[PDB]
Amino acid sequence: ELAGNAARDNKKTRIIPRHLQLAIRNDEELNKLLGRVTIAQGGVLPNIQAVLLPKKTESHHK
């Protein structure tokens, strides 16, 4: 279910491992269950630490 939700989010009709990894890591309970599990071809979450991103001095107010 969650993987199909991620697929629709990506406008995809076929479930891929990416969606399974996204699903797992985006679910607190599954993340706990599979915290020490490696999903082949899963990649990682788009998680960037707030302090490494460029400043509010970004040059485009508008």
Partner: protein, 98 residues
Amino acid sequence: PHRYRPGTVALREIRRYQKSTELLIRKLPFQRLVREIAQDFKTDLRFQSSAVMALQEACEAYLVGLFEDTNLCAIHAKRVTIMPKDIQLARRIRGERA
């Protein structure tokens, strides 16, 4: 000539590789390293190709996780530059004594 500031391209690369899942290490040198190491334990061993792919998957996931912990240690130390001591700390805390 047009010139981007330091960090912009790094961030773009982060976003690119974090959006994708393809393997970032070259297949052949990895096979050669594996074969050399295994050779040091037992001679004339063979490997299934998918076994090598599995080893690569494990290795890369392990390395990104270590670099993540390293990054948190650096940030904790008010830095943005990772250092050996950060890796050593992260590995020590996981108990990867070695």
